[PDB]
Amino acid sequence: GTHSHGLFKKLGIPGPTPLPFLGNILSYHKGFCMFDMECHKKYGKVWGFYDGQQPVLAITDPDMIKTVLVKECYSVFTNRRPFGPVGFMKSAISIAEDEEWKRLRSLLSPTFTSGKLKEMVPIIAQYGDVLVRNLRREAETGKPVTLKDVFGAYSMDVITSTSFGVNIDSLNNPQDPFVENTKKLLRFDFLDPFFLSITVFPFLIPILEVLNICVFPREVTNFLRKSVKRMKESRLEDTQKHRVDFLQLMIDSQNSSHKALSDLELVAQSIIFIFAGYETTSSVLSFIMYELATHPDVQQKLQEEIDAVLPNKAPPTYDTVLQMEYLDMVVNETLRLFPIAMRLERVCKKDVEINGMFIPKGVVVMIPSYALHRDPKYWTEPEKFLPERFSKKNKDNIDPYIYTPFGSGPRNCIGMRFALMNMKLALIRVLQNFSFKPCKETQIPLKLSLGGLLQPEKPVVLKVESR
Amino acid sequence: GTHSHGLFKKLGIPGPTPLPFLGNILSYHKGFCMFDMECHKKYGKVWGFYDGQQPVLAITDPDMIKTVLVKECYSVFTNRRPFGPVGFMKSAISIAEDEEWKRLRSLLSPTFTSGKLKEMVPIIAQYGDVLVRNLRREAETGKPVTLKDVFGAYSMDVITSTSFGVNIDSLNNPQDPFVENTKKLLRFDFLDPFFLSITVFPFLIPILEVLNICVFPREVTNFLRKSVKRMKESRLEDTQKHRVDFLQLMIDSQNSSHKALSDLELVAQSIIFIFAGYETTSSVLSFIMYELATHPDVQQKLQEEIDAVLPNKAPPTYDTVLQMEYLDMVVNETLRLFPIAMRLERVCKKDVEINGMFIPKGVVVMIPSYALHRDPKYWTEPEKFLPERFSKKNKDNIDPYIYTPFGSGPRNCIGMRFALMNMKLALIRVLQNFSFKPCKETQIPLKLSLGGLLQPEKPVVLKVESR
Numbered sequence: 001g002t003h004s005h006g007l008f009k010k011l012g013i014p015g016p017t018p019l020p021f022l023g024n025i026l027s028y029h030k031g032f033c034m035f036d037m038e039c040h041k042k043y044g045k046v047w048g049f050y051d052g053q054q055p056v057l058a059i060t061d062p063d064m065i066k067t068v069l070v071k072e073c074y075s076v077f078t079n080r081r082p083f084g085p086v087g088f089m090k091s092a093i094s095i096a097e098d099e100e101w102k103r104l105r106s107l108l109s110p111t112f113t114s115g116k117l118k119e120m121v122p123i124i125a126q127y128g129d130v131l132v133r134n135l136r137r138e139a140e141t142g143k144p145v146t147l148k149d150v151f152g153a154y155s156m157d158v159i160t161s162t163s164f165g166v167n168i169d170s171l172n173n174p175q176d177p178f179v180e181n182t183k184k185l186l187r188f189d190f191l192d193p194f195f196l197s198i199t200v201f202p203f204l205i206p207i208l209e210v211l212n213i214c215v216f217p218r219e220v221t222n223f224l225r226k227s228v229k230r231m232k233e234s235r236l237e238d239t240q241k242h243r244v245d246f247l248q249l250m251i252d253s254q255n256s257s258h259k260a261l262s263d264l265e266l267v268a269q270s271i272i273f274i275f276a277g278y279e280t281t282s283s284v285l286s287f288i289m290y291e292l293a294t295h296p297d298v299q300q301k302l303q304e305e306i307d308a309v310l311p312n313k314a315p316p317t318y319d320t321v322l323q324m325e326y327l328d329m330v331v332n333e334t335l336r337l338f339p340i341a342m343r344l345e346r347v348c349k350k351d352v353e354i355n356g357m358f359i360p361k362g363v364v365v366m367i368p369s370y371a372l373h374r375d376p377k378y379w380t381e382p383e384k385f386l387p388e389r390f391s392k393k394n395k396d397n398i399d400p401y402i403y404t405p406f407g408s409g410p411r412n413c414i415g416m417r418f419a420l421m422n423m424k425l426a427l428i429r430v431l432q433n434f435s436f437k438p439c440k441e442t443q444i445p446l447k448l449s450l451g452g453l454l455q456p457e458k459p460v461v462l463k464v465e466s467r
Numbered sequence: 468g469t470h471s472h473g474l475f476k477k478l479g480i481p482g483p484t485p486l487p488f489l490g491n492i493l494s495y496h497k498g499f500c501m502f503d504m505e506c507h508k509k510y511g512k513v514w515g516f517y518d519g520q521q522p523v524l525a526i527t528d529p530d531m532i533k534t535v536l537v538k539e540c541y542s543v544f545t546n547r548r549p550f551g552p553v554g555f556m557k558s559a560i561s562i563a564e565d566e567e568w569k570r571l572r573s574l575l576s577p578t579f580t581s582g583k584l585k586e587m588v589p590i591i592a593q594y595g596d597v598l599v600r601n602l603r604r605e606a607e608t609g610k611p612v613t614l615k616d617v618f619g620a621y622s623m624d625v626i627t628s629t630s631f632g633v634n635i636d637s638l639n640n641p642q643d644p645f646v647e648n649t650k651k652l653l654r655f656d657f658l659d660p661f662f663l664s665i666t667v668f669p670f671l672i673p674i675l676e677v678l679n680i681c682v683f684p685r686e687v688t689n690f691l692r693k694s695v696k697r698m699k700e701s702r703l704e705d706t707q708k709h710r711v712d713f714l715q716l717m718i719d720s721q722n723s724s725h726k727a728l729s730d731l732e733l734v735a736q737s738i739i740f741i742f743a744g745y746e747t748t749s750s751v752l753s754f755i756m757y758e759l760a761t762h763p764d765v766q767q768k769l770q771e772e773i774d775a776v777l778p779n780k781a782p783p784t785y786d787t788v789l790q791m792e793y794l795d796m797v798v799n800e801t802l803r804l805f806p807i808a809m810r811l812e813r814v815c816k817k818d819v820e821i822n823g824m825f826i827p828k829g830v831v832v833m834i835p836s837y838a839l840h841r842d843p844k845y846w847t848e849p850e851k852f853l854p855e856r857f858s859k860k861n862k863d864n865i866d867p868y869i870y871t872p873f874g875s876g877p878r879n880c881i882g883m884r885f886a887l888m889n890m891k892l893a894l895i896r897v898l899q900n901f902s903f904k905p906c907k908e909t910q911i912p913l914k915l916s917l918g919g920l921l922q923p924e925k926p927v928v929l930k931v932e933s934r
């Protein structure tokens with residue numbers, strides 16, 4: 001009942017007093033972010049709470065966050081919190097643990113070098129132009145535009161081609177088999193009834209694993225396992241058309257210290273890259289277009305910067321993307337306000353003392369990225385969208401352990417450079433062509449979901465006018 | 468269903484073909500020992516089977532057993548197979564794992580040195596004389612004697628006094644609170660319905676742990692937790708009566724590298740020493756008295772040896788016990804025929820290759836002590852009780868990885884020297900006084916249980932005549 005609930009009381013650590021069985025989950029009625037903000041204001045730099053019987057220790061000091069995320073990563077803080085049932089997706093790099101993770105991360109890093117990314121840019125840019133043609137169709141018809149639909153389709157297009165060589169105008173092929181299945185790989189709402197039920201009954205996870213029940217929908221993982229094997233074969237026959245997708249890069253890796261990726265592991269990476277990058281990219285893109293529609297001066301400045309680097313609507317390149325400083329500032333400032341991961345977490349696998357504080361074995365150590373991104377101690381007027389924060393002049397005062405939209409240390413976002421390049425390539429191609437102005441039905445100011453995902457209450461709709 | 472059942476088929480390893488869900492447990496209808504003998508005869512040096520979905524790899528080569536039990540103990544083969552639900556007995560040294568085990572084993576080894584044992588001998592010998600007075604009462608009344616009752620009471624007497632300073636003629640006080648509770652700490656029958664059900668439904672263990680259901684009976688562990696705390700206090704007051712029991716030795720250890728034993732850990736050791744030594748000691752003692760009643764020449768020789776070392780029925784001492792060579796040979800030969808642990812087991816925690824064979828992570832590696840003790844390749848006429856096997860002349864040919872009545876390596880029986888001293892002290896004091904002859908109701912030859920414990924089908928009853 002109150003089996004594990006005496007922990008933070010004994011260590012002297014403050015927090016919200018838990019209820020038997022539930023722990024503190026009734027406090028999630030306003031979402032993770034409002035709960036972490038409120039805990040921070042009340043209890044200060046460190047506090048504890050219980051997801052059911054699972055103790056979670058929140059930390060906010062940048063030197064102590066560096067010890068967890070960086071310094072003692074391989075020794076103590078290696079793994080994220082177990083969730084399940086995951087079935088074979090246990091072999092996905094984001095879910096693997098200890099030596100399996102370290103091996104998988106070693107096997108996959110060459111797949112995310114800037115050289116392989118530079119090679120993928122011509123593919124991504126192709127669907128930037130596809131986004132423009134579809135944006136135009138909805139702009140020449142004066143009609144408000146749902147960002148997540150048009151950015152969802154773009155993120156989908158980039159995914160299908162950069163991971164499998166599958167080239168699809170998903171917007172206009174919404175019933176292509178590959179689109180209908182990929183659309184289902186959406187991030188998990190850990191506040192929905194099923195996951196809250198598992199949190200309160202974690203002893204039921206083994207029961208679901210043995211019945212082959214799985215949080216990754218069976219129909220979609222089956223479709224991709226057999227889709228991947230069909231590509232694996234057919235790539236061995238017509239072996240002249242060189243490919244630059246993730247699949248091909250992972251196929252070449254098993255043609256080898258460590259063991260090469262097994263065919264099942266490879267399918268698990270392919271699945272988790274999609275899950276990791278699909279709804280995230282489109283969510284961020286939508287948040288950015290919101291800030292630019294509500295800050296027309298910022299939008300004008302960015303469009304001026306783009307036309308200076310790429311005159312006469314010249315196609316963006318790898319090097320010209322990295323050149324655009326205000327674009328980078330706009331992306332970063334949006335990710336400060338909306339760090340869609342919300343939290344970073346590591347399990348404490350050993351009794352440890354770091355920076356002076358004792359951490360018992362088994363605790364989940366949580367870094368509350370949303371709250372730290374909005375803390376007045378590091379960010380003046382934290383609620384205002386102000387890209388000059390990230391000017392090269394002010395970048396000296398920004399702690400890489402307070403601003404963590406992609407995490408930090410060995411287990412950070414492995415697709416970070418890819419996601420940044422992919423979002424900026426879309427942004428340039430869109431802003432070269434259009435301007436984005438509010439509607440009357442634009443939620444101004446935008447409200448966040450009370451749910452377990454960082455996303456707007458109402459969808460973001462805006463008017464799109466052709467330049 | 469047949470989730471894990473393709474393992475040994477793929478590795479090329481032979482074994483009995485498993486049924487869905489059950490694995491091979493229907494083959495346990497003749498017990499562990501007959502199953503391991505039969506597997507050995509059929510499949511040779513190495514074979515595999517499934518306890519439910521749990522693969523077990525049996526090994527028989529002494530160089531490969533040394534690698535598991537000795538060479539790669541700390542790195543790969545550290546832990547025994549999980550069973551549960553165990554509740555807080557998770558902190559008992561025999562159940563602890565990895566770094567917890569290593570710490571507990573380090574903290575408890577000084578408690579089992581020959582110096583502390585020499586100091587406990589006067590206590591143990593006291594109950595040797597108590598065994599004699601009770602044996603006499605049943606000998607002057609010509610009436611057959613149930614060994615396990617008279618050796619059970621002796622093992623109980625030695626336990627209560629050497630671990631808690633509690634001095635009781637348990638035979639004649641069978642309703643003393645301390646006796647009635649200790650009598651319940653009996654070894655587990657892993658072939659009984661409850662444990663077979665858990666083997667086939669291991670996913671139910673977490674469900675029982677959360678309801679505080681536990682294989683160590685709650686009533687008995689509660690009685691001992693509060694009995695121990697009563698002694699812990701009262702030992703701090705009258706601190707003049709020096710004590711030499713395990714409790715006192717563990718109390719002195721928390722008056723300190725490692726963390727000292729917590730009060731809950733200490734109670735867990737106290738419990739597991741009883742469980743480990745109570746039914747085992749009396750079982751072996753009974754098997755020995757059987758062999759001596761069925762081999763009167765061996766019995767005469769041993770009694771002659773005792774009267775040569777201890778003339779005029781002199782009290783046995785530490786040094787005079789270690790002097791008696793034929794006594795040691797009789798004990799060892801009995802433990803060859805009846806190695807009551809039946810199997811040694813280690814979990815394989817890593818992908819390993821030892822002595823040329825691949826062992827996947829998660830496999831249970833089993834050393835089938837009963838079968839190896841009766842293998843014709845190492846033991847001529849293995850079924851005959853022949854103590855000369857262990858003469859100093861022939862001790863050169865006996866492989867310490869074939870003969871493993873107490874296991875081997877860092878995780879071997881930590882109470883081994885104590886158990887040997889305790890059984891020999893009883894044997895001497897009894898044989899100095901009595902001779903043991905069969906009954907008509909003596910099961911000759913004795914048959915082993917078809918159950919999960921190495922024990923006689925029928926109880927062992929014998930006539931006891933005073934010398």
Ligand code: HEM
Pocket residue numbers: 093094095105272273274276277278280281284340341344345404405406407408410411412413414415416418419
């Ligand atoms: C704007 C889009 C994205 C954001 C905001 C984002 C953010 C994050 C964050 C916060 C983490 C946790 C890191 C930590 O715990 O410290 C993470 C992990 C990860 N991300 Fe991203 N990500 C994005 C896109 C992508 C993409 C496109 C991929 C494609 C490969 C990807 C692959 C991964 C993987 C595999 C992990 C787990 C890495 C590991 O455990 O070793 N993400 N991401």
Ligand code: HEM
Pocket residue numbers: 560561562572739740741743744745747748751807808811812871872873874875877878879880881882883885886
């Ligand atoms: C004739 C009586 C006994 C026999 C045949 C016996 C045999 C064994 C065997 C075969 C093991 C397994 C070792 C391995 O896995 O390699 C073991 C472990 C153990 N025994 Fe004994 N034992 C006896 C009496 C005792 C006694 C009196 C104690 C009192 C302390 C004791 C304490 C232990 C402990 C604590 C372990 C687990 C050690 C660890 O995991 O580190 N045993 N015993």
Ligand SMILES: Cn1c(=O)c2c(ncn2C)n(C)c1=O
Pocket residue numbers: 051081082083084190195199345
């Ligand atoms: C609240 N919560 C999480 O936030 C979570 C989780 N697994 C992963 N995360 C992030 N589980 C099981 C959970 O209950």
Ligand SMILES: Cn1c(=O)c2c(ncn2C)n(C)c1=O
Pocket residue numbers: 192194195213214215216
């Ligand atoms: C509502 N819901 C889920 O949300 C879910 C699930 N299995 C996995 N997930 C994520 N099941 C069975 C379910 O009923």
Ligand SMILES: Cn1c(=O)c2c(ncn2C)n(C)c1=O
Pocket residue numbers: 080094095272275276277280340341
């Ligand atoms: C913890 N975490 C994230 O927070 C995440 C992600 N992909 C995107 N995000 C935001 N992955 C794979 C992940 O493991």
Ligand SMILES: Cn1c(=O)c2c(ncn2C)n(C)c1=O
Pocket residue numbers: 518548549550551657662666812
């Ligand atoms: C057959 N068997 C054992 O023999 C066993 C066990 N746990 C320990 N042992 C020894 N379990 C769960 C088991 O099913």
Ligand SMILES: Cn1c(=O)c2c(ncn2C)n(C)c1=O
Pocket residue numbers: 659661662680681682683
């Ligand atoms: C028969 N049986 C057992 O043998 C048992 C048990 N809990 C532990 N054990 C060992 N329960 C609940 C049980 O019904």
Ligand SMILES: Cn1c(=O)c2c(ncn2C)n(C)c1=O
Pocket residue numbers: 547561562739742743744747807808
């Ligand atoms: C595996 N095992 C045994 O086989 C054993 C024992 N005590 C006696 N025996 C036989 N203990 C504590 C143990 O863990």
